[PDB]
Ligand binder design. Structure first.
Ligand code: ATP
Ligand code: LAB
Ligand code: CA
Lengths: 364, 134
């Protein structure tokens, strides 16, 4: 009767109950196995707690499930340890990347019905749920998490598949890049553990400059853009232009040797791959979702940059909701708890008839 | 053209009540048959343009197409099915090549109350059925 919503990201799982405002559980998307052979595996917070006596793996790479055995542990842990349910008692809504290969969609469906025996399930595109969470059905989503960044133009609830842009540059790369440039300053972060500290520096003190060159002037003329930060050991470090050089990577991917144009231009590119007759709607409904879109100043920077590329009188609006670390989960919660959605579920009777390929018929 | 083709059309319209009009295009690009409530004759050039479209890496595809004076935005385009939807509520069009990726087509004009993709499984199946018959 109460549906479940599981949003599986490259870095973080967001899981919960349909009709709730927030995921009940947010935890790292990792499976740990003992270094010597207490349990055969561990997932999430617990894998992290015991990191030092385990070997940690990420089953999802750039938003795509690649380690199916480890993914099954994550799903089992989600049902039994985080949500404390029996999966056979609950319709389960899952999420996926844009352009998720067909065989992955089937395998997700196969595992849910055959291994977890769910009475019903559904899978939706993440960016599409973010748009749904801002109360819109037409728009272009910039979805940027830990592993992957997409531009996703959507018309009336469905992605325009020919117009989707994928870019393999997201939060984990920005943490690695911020690790790289704090070495210029004298400091030293290289291990898994040191990387996590740099993730926290990134999250607290980074921001997107409105104009990058004006910000580089102001930083190297004075120290009014310098902030201090305290390492777990006790050393107090100072960072300046690293604050905005790190996320400048999104708008200038050549900062980490990558060839792609920046998120602003990929937005334009994606809009331009669509028909002119919905372009006004696309420009006026630019929704950011994902943790990597949380940098202060990024809405205003994106507003400026798209305005310079768009026709001069085009109406441009960036929608950056406070809750956008979880917009994807929220979209799924609203979708799945809706009265009108209860015909949309792939039922177990439907799966038994048509096998895993049913998902193509019922989930776009 | 034959009684089995008309039987396919009759069956499709019986099973999908939101299918308002049908047209079948032959291997040669011409109209095999179509329902009496519309005529796609004057639009065969853009329809056959879309059916024979094969994009190279950088080429932008057709994003819009007009049939009997209704403008349809393309929202789905594979060799199996192509979906056009009018953005002012005047309906949708499903265009399923015959065979898959081929020059023929089963075309279903859909009532604006339906979601276009709901009719898709049946329409795709009747396009498969028409491979032998054109
Ligand atoms: N305030 C913040 N400022 C900058 N970055 C942040 C902030 N909060 C979280 N992040 C980053 O966002 C990422 C997590 O975002 P999210 O949970 O949306 O990604 P994901 O779904 O795990 O991955 P993907 O969507 O790429 O598969 C991490 O890289 C994290 O460092
Ligand atoms: C608080 C938190 C945030 C996060 O986003 O976590 C995810 C998942 C995490 C898994 C390993 C880590 C050691 C465990 C827990 C940290 C979880 O890796 C990340 O921190 C990776 C490595 S550094 C980075 O930016 N992303 C992102
Ligand atoms: Ca995500």
């Amino acid at each position: 009767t109460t549906a479940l919503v599981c949003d599986n990201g490259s870095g973080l799982v967001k899981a919960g109950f349909a009709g709730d405002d927030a995921p009940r559980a947010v935890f790292p998307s990792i499976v740990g196995r003992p270094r010597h052979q207490q349990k055969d595996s561990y997932v999430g917070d617990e894998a992290q707690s015991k990191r030092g006596i385990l070997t940690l793996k990420y089953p999802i790479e750039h938003g795509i499930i690649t380690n199916w055995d480890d993914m099954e542990k994550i799903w089992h842990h989600t049902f039994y340890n985080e949500l404390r349910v029996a999966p056979e008692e609950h319709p389960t809504l899952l999420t996926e990347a844009p352009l998720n290969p067909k065989a992955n969609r089937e395998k997700m469906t196969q595992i849910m019905f055959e291994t977890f025996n769910v009475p019903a399930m559904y899978v939706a595109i993440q960016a599409v749920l973010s748009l749904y969470a801002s109360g819109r059905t037409t728009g272009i989503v910039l979805d940027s998490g830990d592993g992957v960044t997409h531009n996703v133009p959507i018309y009336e609830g469905y992605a325009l598949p020919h117009a989707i842009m994928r870019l393999d540059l997201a939060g984990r790369d920005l943490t690695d890049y911020l690790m790289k440039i704090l070495t210029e300053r004298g400091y030293s972060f290289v291990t898994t553990a040191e990387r996590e500290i740099v993730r926290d520096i990134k999250e607290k003190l980074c921001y997107v400059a409105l104009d990058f060159e004006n910000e580089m002037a102001t930083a190297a003329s004075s120290s009014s853009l310098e902030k201090s930060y305290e390492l777990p050991d006790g050393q107090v470090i100072t960072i300046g232009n690293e604050r905005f050089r790190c996320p400048e990577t999104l708008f200038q991917p050549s900062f980490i040797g990558m060839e792609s144009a920046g998120i602003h231009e990929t937005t334009y590119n994606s809009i331009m791959k669509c028909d002119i007759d919905i372009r006004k709607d696309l420009y006026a409904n630019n929704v950011m979702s994902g943790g990597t879109t949380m940098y202060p100043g990024i809405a205003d920077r994106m507003q400026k940059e798209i305005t310079a590329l768009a026709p001069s009188t085009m109406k441009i609006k960036i929608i950056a909701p406070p809750e956008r670390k979880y917009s994807v989960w929220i979209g799924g919660s609203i979708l799945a708890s809706l009265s009108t959605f209860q015909q949309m579920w792939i039922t177990k009777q439907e799966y038994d008839e048509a096998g895993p390929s049913i998902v193509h018929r019922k989930c776009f | 053209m034959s009684e089995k083709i008309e039987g396919i059309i009759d069956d499709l319209l019986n099973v999908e009540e939101n299918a308002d009009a049908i047209a079948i295009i032959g291997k040669d690009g011409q109209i095999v048959t179509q329902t009496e409530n519309w005529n796609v004759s004057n639009d065969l050039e853009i329809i056959n343009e879309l059916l024979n479209e094969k994009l190279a890496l950088g080429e932008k595809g057709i994003t819009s197409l007009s049939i009997q004076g209704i403008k349809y935005m393309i929202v789905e385009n594979t060799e199996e099915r192509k979906i056009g939807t009018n953005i002012t509520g005047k309906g949708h069009v499903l265009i399923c090549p015959i065979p898959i990726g081929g020059p023929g087509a089963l075309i279903a004009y859909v009532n604006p109350r339906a979601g276009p993709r709901d009719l898709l499984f049946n329409v795709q199946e009747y396009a498969k059925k028409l491979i032998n018959l054109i």
